[PDB]
Ligand binder design. Structure first.
Ligand SMILES: [Cu+2]
Ligand SMILES: [Cu+2]
Ligand SMILES: [Cu+2]
Ligand SMILES: [Cu+2]
Lengths: 102, 102
């Protein structure tokens, strides 16, 4: 049962639009099974049903890191990254990271 | 050189969020080569760099129709569908349809 140790953007961060989103876990991820979806849950001034933003997901420089690369620049608003992490123990762990763009 | 004959949502339409976007061409499309990308170009009150929205593209009930299915509900704003149509004549034709959601 791997744990999300940290991320950039960090949970609850509000700032610049990220070129890539890094999720750092407590255990080495098995890439074939670990995934993420990026959704926008609000624009400034108005919440909306989650709208899936095109993104690619891959491994980073470290086996414990999952990288989400939006296909395009993220506009101002609120986003969530819904993640699934699987290590060598085979248990699928899910969670979400929420952050805001300026 | 196939032509876009019509679409739903229609070019410049402003109304409800579409469950699917249909593009109707003058010639039968070859599915392997015909494609589309859906981007959002504005929220209400603010234009922004085009942000790619996750969508699947396939053929409709008629060989002349290309269907774009957003993965999630489209929020209010302006969208463009950047399309590539290829018929049996092999010439790749591109264009864009712009519409607004309520
Ligand atoms: Cu476990
Ligand atoms: Cu939004
Ligand atoms: Cu032609
Ligand atoms: Cu927008």
């Amino acid at each position: 049962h791997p744990k999300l140790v940290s991320s950039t953007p960090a949970e609850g961060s509000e700032g610049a639009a990220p070129a890539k989103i890094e999720l750092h876990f407590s255990e080495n991820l098995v890439t074939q099974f670990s995934g993420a979806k990026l959704v926008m849950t609000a624009m400034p001034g108005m919440e909306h049903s989650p709208m899936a933003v095109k993104a690619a997901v891959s491994g980073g420089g470290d086996p414990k890191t999952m990288v989400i690369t939006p296909a395009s620049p993220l506009t101002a608003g609120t986003y969530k990254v819904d993640w699934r992490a699987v290590s060598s123990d085979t248990h699928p762990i899910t969670g979400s990271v929420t952050f805001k763009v300026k």
